[PDB]
Amino acid sequence: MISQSRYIRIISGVGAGAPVAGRKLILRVMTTNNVIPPGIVIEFDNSNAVMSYFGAQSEEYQRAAAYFKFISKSVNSPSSISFARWVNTAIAPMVVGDNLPKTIADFAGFSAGVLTIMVGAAEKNITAIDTSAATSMDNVASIIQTEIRKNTDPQLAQATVTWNQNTNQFTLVGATIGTGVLAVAKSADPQDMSTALGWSTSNVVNVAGQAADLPDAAVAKSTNVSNNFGSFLFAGAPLDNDQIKAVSAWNAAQNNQFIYTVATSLANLGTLFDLVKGNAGTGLHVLSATAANDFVEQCPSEIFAATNYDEPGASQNYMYYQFPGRNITVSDDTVANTVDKSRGNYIGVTQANGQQLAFYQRGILCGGPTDAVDMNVYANEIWLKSAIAQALLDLFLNVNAVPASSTGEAMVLAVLQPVLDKATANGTFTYGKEISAVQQQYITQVTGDRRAWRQVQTLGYWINITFSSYTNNNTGLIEWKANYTLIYSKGDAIRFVEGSDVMI
Amino acid sequence: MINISAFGSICQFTASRTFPNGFTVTEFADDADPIDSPPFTAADTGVGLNGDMVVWNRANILEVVVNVIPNTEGERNLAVLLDANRTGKDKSGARDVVGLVVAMPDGSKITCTNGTPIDGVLINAVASVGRLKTKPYRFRFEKVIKAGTS
Amino acid sequence: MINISAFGSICQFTASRTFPNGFTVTEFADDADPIDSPPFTAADTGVGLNGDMVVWNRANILEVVVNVIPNTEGERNLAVLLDANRTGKDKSGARDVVGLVVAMPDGSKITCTNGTPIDGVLINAVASVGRLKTKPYRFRFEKVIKAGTS
């Protein structure tokens, strides 16, 4: 008789399935493992996904993606991550294809297979690959690569096909470093393995081989892939100090859209501070010289992906948190103070009538001249630029171009202003403030009228758009562009209490 | 430019639910006031026995009345917004938040937010001669902001 | 056609009990407003202590006032409908539903349904010179629907 499960399905147990996943400004990890192709970004949404795609023992799932366990101050947890490639060495061709888990049962009739390769001028006729009786995909790979190696082309001199079971991917690398413009050609038989390997469907790009672009330009390409981020870890082996300075300086020049992190152990703080002091905002943290079971720099990376920036109650001061499963890198008063004055977030320890506490002491970034110099404040600036740019992008996708006279400012301001309402009813802005002589003069002379400093003193912001005419690289026509200036009100948050108990 | 003219005005509207990245209203009425606002209160005083005045800063929300020429693109959009927000029988009303930006020709801009429609005619009334009567619409916003001078 | 004329308007009335497949009114008054509607409410706001604006989307029913020329076929049918609906001594009132469709010349049509007469004069008033005074009738409808653009 027809079962009750056809109509009502009471999935008992720990069924779960919260659809409330949606907190942007996610962590990016620039890893070195060539499991990720060098030039595309995969946005994983759970530790299970990172365990599936990436290695089960790789730091990408063990060290990273254990940040999904972070419980924020209220209830929230991060729910999305992204990864990219460092581009360690000079790039050889690494043509990667078909994450689909195709099985040998599909290729169980591919005797004397024809796997043609289109290298442009070197379109080949590689055949004689027996997969009807093979020994798993990883030794189908051997037969394939040897049949490539019969052709004495310098590129296809020692071909290398790999089968990664975690991704279930067939990756044709090849031999010739320096220039790797390759592809795969399609044949016509059951024995043919061009699209059966998924090397011609859509899951190949070329992975063209270039030279190394180690510190900076790789991150620039990664950002060009996807602007959806909030902070990039740049994990793996500790980078060189000079390339670290370059990495910090590049996206100090970017200023917007990024907080970036530097992992160094103790006694590197003075030199690193001297090289990187200033340069917008970078998170320098003291690493425990004993072990590395804590991913240290994940402290900014976790909280940032748990704020949710849509419900009132954002901002967290970024200092007094209670990160578990982490090692106490600083446990002495003199050590704590010497780490300080050189920035450095030392995740220390204390005691209070017993117990031991924890803390993620200090949230100064580096800054110093005029920057946000505070992870809370810089975090809010990041998501303000994110939301405003998204609102303008939707405005322009809806209707292209704004009449740049006086109504264009009207649509621009009217689209921007709900973002400002969210900011006011999020905790990022501040109702009050006591803009004083220096701040009064500064606000007056930046762009605002004489009586604009009043508004920031009572409301929290002053936003105005003008239009400017500029010329581009090739556009002979003088183009016009918007210019919105918005005066952030900052916002303080106490971190020290001083008492004066009298009369005992 | 301290000039008293306002010919050259415009009213950008955005509704979070109904008109995200909303419309333009530029066809204001000629007989009635294009943009009008009832006087704000902002305080209230009471005199004691010996003359001690007591000042109360009552929180209040400003109001705007926009008169528009009826059966027009901006006006049709306004009527659509009001009909979406209004509540009748068997229809579902979307409680949204509207934001109105006026860019007067002298350069100054006034933006008001966290508001909602408060009135409307809902039927194109016909005047005596045959002309359509200008349709007024009233909003009550929560926050007002002045940006830009001259 | 975004013009401001309304000459050529028509009022198709349908009453469920009195005039099923009802009449048409075209001889509107010249001095008073042919079609008028009081301003809808559609919402109502208050303000808290710290400035929190608070909205209620109060349900409401729209109103129409039609002025018609005395002692004409359309207004005679209107007075028949109102006398059927009105309640007096020894007479039986028919509680019916009425529907008014205005087809303004420019093309748009506004149809209001689930209504009832709300006023009337019942006696042809005489003005000073001898002209009969224009008769206004008021209805309050439940559901209004706008159909057709240009």
Is the distance from CB of A251 to CB of A28 less than 8 angstroms?
no
Residue A196 φ then ψ, to 5°: -70, -40
Which one-letter amino acid corresponds to residue A397? L
Taking contacts as CB-CB distances below 8 angstroms, the residues of chain B near C62 are 122-123
Rounded Cα distance, B3 and A437, in Å: 31
Chain B interface, best mutation among A413, A453, A455, by max B CB count within 10 A: A413
Dihedral angle computed from the Cα positions of residues A72, A76, A80 and A85, in that order, rounded to the nearest 10 degrees: 0
Long-range contacts, A424-427 (Cβ 8 Å, 24+):
A424/A460, A424/A461, A424/B143, A425/A312, A426/A309, A426/A310, A426/A311, A426/A312, A426/A313, A426/A314, A426/A315, A427/A312, A427/A313, A427/A314, A427/A315, A427/A491
Given the DSSP bridges, would you call strands B24-25 and B11-15 parallel, antiparallel or unpaired? antiparallel
Structure tokens at A465: 């758009």
Is the distance from CB of A241 to CB of A262 less than 8 angstroms?
no
Residue A54 φ then ψ, to 5°: -75, 175
Is the distance from CB of A336 to CB of A346 less than 8 angstroms?
yes
Rounded Cα distance, A27 and A315, in Å: 18
Structure tokens at A341: 């004055």
Rounded Cα distance, A264 and A238, in Å: 7
Structure tokens at C96: 């019916």
Contacts of B81 (CB under 8 A, 6+ apart): B13, B15, B18, B19, B98, B117
Chain B interface, best mutation among A415, A429, A450, by max B CB count within 10 A: A415
Taking contacts as CB-CB distances below 8 angstroms, the residues of chain A near B114 are 421
C102 and B123: CB-CB below 8 Å? yes
> Which of A410, A421, A463 is closest, CB to CB, to B12?
A410
Chain C interface, best mutation among B30, B86, B92, by max C CB count within 10 A: B86
A308: left (phi over 0), alpha (psi -120 to 50) or beta: left
Q: List the chains bordering chain A where 3 or more Cβ pairs fall under 8 Å.
A: B
Q: How many CB atoms lie within 10 A of CB A306?
A: 20
Taking contacts as CB-CB distances below 8 angstroms, the residues of chain B near A411 are 12, 21, 24
Q: List the chains bordering chain B where 3 or more Cβ pairs fall under 8 Å.
A: A, C
Long-range contacts, A303-306 (Cβ 8 Å, 24+):
A303/A70, A303/A72, A304/A25, A304/A27, A304/A230, A304/A231, A304/A259, A304/A379, A305/A23, A305/A25, A305/A26, A305/A27, A305/A67, A305/A78, A305/A79, A305/A80, A305/A230, A306/A23, A306/A70, A306/A72, A306/A76, A306/A77, A306/A78
Rounded Cα distance, A183 and A160, in Å: 14
**DSSP for A321-376, written as a single string:** ----S---S--SHHHHHHHTTS--B------SSS-----------S--SSS--SHH
Residue A18 φ then ψ, to 5°: -70, 120
B119 and C42: CB-CB below 8 Å? yes
Taking contacts as CB-CB distances below 8 angstroms, the residues of chain A near B105 are 406
B107 and A406: CB-CB below 8 Å? yes
Rounded Cα distance, A48 and A66, in Å: 10
Contacts of B61 (CB under 8 A, 6+ apart): B140, B141, B142, C45, C47, C53
Structure tokens at A217: 């330009």
> Which of B79, B128, B131 is closest, CB to CB, to C31?
B128
Sign of CA dihedral B46, B48, B51, B54: negative
Min Cα distance C88 → chain B (Å) is 30
Is the distance from CB of A309 to CB of A381 less than 8 angstroms?
no
Can you tell me whether residue C86 is helix, strand or coil? coil
| E-strand stretches of chain C | 11-15, 24-25, 35-36, 44-47, 53-56, 62-68, 98-103, 109-115, 135-141, 143-147
What experiment produced this structure?
A: cryo-EM
C47 and B60: CB-CB below 8 Å? yes
What count of Cα atoms within 13 Å lies in the side-chain half-sphere of residue B67?
12
Rounded Cα distance, A276 and A247, in Å: 10
> Which of B122, B123, B131 is closest, CB to CB, to C35?
B123
In chain B, the residue whose alpha carbon lies closest to the alpha carbon of A412 is: B21
B21 and A394: CB-CB below 8 Å? yes
Is the distance from CB of B106 to CB of B25 less than 8 angstroms?
no
Taking contacts as CB-CB distances below 8 angstroms, the residues of chain B near A455 are 145-146
Rounded Cα distance, A359 and A376, in Å: 16
Rounded Cα distance, A278 and A252, in Å: 9
Min Cα distance C38 → chain B (Å) is 6
Rounded Cα distance, A399 and A42, in Å: 31
Count of residues in chain A: 504
Helix (H) or strand (E) holding B146: strand B143-147
Rounded Cα distance, A457 and A455, in Å: 5
Structure tokens at C111: 């149809």
Among residues A180, A14, A17, A24, the alpha carbon closest in space to that of A96 is found at A180
Chain B interface, best mutation among C1, C3, C4, by max B CB count within 10 A: C4
In chain C, the residue whose alpha carbon lies closest to the alpha carbon of B113 is: C53
Structure tokens at A360: 């993620």
Residue A491 φ then ψ, to 5°: 140, 125
Min Cα distance A27 → chain B (Å) is 29
B14 and A413: CB-CB below 8 Å? no
B22 and A449: CB-CB below 8 Å? no
DSSP letter assigned to residue A502 = -
Is the distance from CB of A141 to CB of A149 less than 8 angstroms?
no
A:B CB pairs within 8 Å:
72
B101 and A414: CB-CB below 8 Å? yes
Task: Give, in order, the Cα–Cα distances in Å from A379 to each of A376, B91, B113, B129.
Answer: 5, 43, 25, 62
Maximum pairwise Cα distance, chain B: 62
The angle that helices A241-254 and A217-225 make with each other, rounded to 10 degrees, is: 40
Rounded Cα distance, A196 and A201, in Å: 9
Min Cα distance B49 → chain A (Å) is 34
Helix (H) or strand (E) holding C71: none
* Number of helical H runs and strand E runs in chain B: 1, 10
Taking contacts as CB-CB distances below 8 angstroms, the residues of chain B near C113 are none
Which one-letter amino acid corresponds to residue B87? T
Query: Chain-centre distance of CA A97, in angstroms?
Result: 24
Residue A81 φ then ψ, to 5°: -140, 160
Task: Give, in order, the Cα–Cα distances in Å from A295 to each of A75, A281, A497, C64.
Answer: 22, 20, 31, 71
Given the DSSP bridges, would you call strands B63-68 and B135-140 parallel, antiparallel or unpaired? antiparallel
Which one-letter amino acid corresponds to residue B68? V
Among residues A90, A38, A60, A388, the alpha carbon closest in space to that of A225 is found at A38
Taking contacts as CB-CB distances below 8 angstroms, the residues of chain B near A395 are 21
Which one-letter amino acid corresponds to residue B10? I
Q: How many CB atoms lie within 10 A of CB B113?
A: 21
Chain A interface, best mutation among B7, B9, B10, by max A CB count within 10 A: B10
C41 and B118: CB-CB below 8 Å? yes
Min Cα distance C78 → chain B (Å) is 19
Can you tell me whether residue A139 is helix, strand or coil? helix
Is the distance from CB of B104 to CB of C13 less than 8 angstroms?
no
Rounded Cα distance, A81 and A91, in Å: 25
Alpha helical stretches, state H, A174-308:
217-225, 241-254, 269-276, 298-304
Taking contacts as CB-CB distances below 8 angstroms, the residues of chain C near B127 are 33-34
Is the distance from CB of A359 to CB of A341 less than 8 angstroms?
no
Is the distance from CB of B35 to CB of B66 less than 8 angstroms?
yes
Structure tokens at C1: 């056609």
DSSP letter assigned to residue A68 = G
Rounded Cα distance, A394 and B21, in Å: 8
Task: Give, in order, the Cα–Cα distances in Å from A267 to each of A52, A177, A335, A348.
Answer: 38, 39, 11, 16
Residue B11, Cβ density class (10 Å: 0-12 exposed, 13-18 middle, ≥19 buried): buried
Rg (CA), chain C: 18
In chain A, the residue whose alpha carbon lies closest to the alpha carbon of B98 is: A418
Contacts of C81 (CB under 8 A, 6+ apart): C13, C15, C18, C19, C98, C117
> Which of C34, C108, C146 is closest, CB to CB, to B126?
C34
Chain A residues with at least one Cβ partner in B under 8 Å: 394-395, 398-399, 406-407, 409-411, 413-415, 417-418, 421, 424, 449, 451, 455, 459, 462-464
Taking contacts as CB-CB distances below 8 angstroms, the residues of chain C near B71 are 2, 4, 104, 106, 108
Structure tokens at A431: 């109702």
Among residues B109, B115, C52, B76, the alpha carbon closest in space to that of A418 is found at B115
Rg (CA), chain B: 18
Instruction: Render the burial of A464-488: b for 16+ CB within 10 Å, e for the rest.
Output: bbebeeeeeeeeeeeeeebeeebbb
A237: left (phi over 0), alpha (psi -120 to 50) or beta: beta
Instruction: Render the burial of B63-81: b for 16+ CB within 10 Å, e for the rest.
Output: bbbbbbbbbbebbbbbbeb
Rounded Cα distance, A455 and B108, in Å: 14
Q: How many CB atoms lie within 10 A of CB A6?
A: 7
Query: Chain-centre distance of CA B99, in angstroms?
Result: 9
Structure tokens at B136: 């007024």
Taking contacts as CB-CB distances below 8 angstroms, the residues of chain C near B119 are 39-42
Q: How many CB atoms lie within 10 A of CB C107?
A: 12
Rounded Cα distance, A69 and A324, in Å: 10
Chain B residues with at least one Cβ partner in C under 8 Å: 59-61, 69-73, 76, 79, 82-83, 85-91, 93, 95, 114-128, 130-133, 136, 138, 140-142
Among residues B127, B25, B41, B31, the alpha carbon closest in space to that of B82 is found at B25
Query: Chain-centre distance of CA A66, in angstroms?
Result: 15
Dihedral angle computed from the Cα positions of residues A210, A216, A221 and A223, in that order, rounded to the nearest 10 degrees: 170
Residue A81, Cβ density class (10 Å: 0-12 exposed, 13-18 middle, ≥19 buried): buried
A395 and B101: CB-CB below 8 Å? no
Rounded Cα distance, A281 and A94, in Å: 35
B147 and A413: CB-CB below 8 Å? yes
In chain B, the residue whose alpha carbon lies closest to the alpha carbon of A466 is: B148
Min Cα distance A318 → chain B (Å) is 30
Q: How many CB atoms lie within 10 A of CB A263?
A: 22
Structure tokens at A299: 């402290």
Q: How many CB atoms lie within 10 A of CB A135?
A: 11
Among residues A375, A366, A376, the alpha carbon closest in space to that of A342 is found at A366
Residue B102 φ then ψ, to 5°: -105, 125
Contacts of A378 (CB under 8 A, 6+ apart): A259, A281, A365, A367, A371, A372
Count of residues in chain B: 150
